Amino acid sequence: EDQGPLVEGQLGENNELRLTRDAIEPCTVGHRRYFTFGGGYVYFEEYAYSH
Amino acid sequence: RRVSARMLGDVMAVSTCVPVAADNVIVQNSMRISSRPGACYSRPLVSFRY
Numbered sequence A: 001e002d003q004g005p006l007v008e009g010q011l012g013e014n015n016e017l018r019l020t021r022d023a024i025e026p027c028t029v030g031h032r033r034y035f036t037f038g039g040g041y042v043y044f045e046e047y048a049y050s051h
Numbered sequence B: 001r002r003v004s005a006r007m008l009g010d011v012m013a014v015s016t017c018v019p020v021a022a023d024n025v026i027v028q029n030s031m032r033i034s035s036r037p038g039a040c041y042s043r044p045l046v047s048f049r050y
Helices: none
Strands: A032-037 A040-045 B025-027 B046-048
Antiparallel strands (some): A032 A040
8 A cells, every 4th residue: 555564575577576585596797687667677787776 | 580589587688690501510420428428418519610
């Protein structure tokens, strides 16, 4: 809800919100990944948010 | 067009592949890995020149 508490979770596919954080993988050099978010995308580089 | 891609998350990247003539490619007569008995490649090996 608009006034509900903040819940911990992880993003999924097709704007899906997952409540469990278990998609762990070894860190790889030169990381880069686009992820669907709302009506656009979220860009990440070296496992760091970009814009 | 013939391209190679890898999952970049919810989107894919692409790279244009370069062609190679058939005469410039040859398959070896065997796959056997003499350096490691018990290990076998799942695809044949090849030698080629651009």
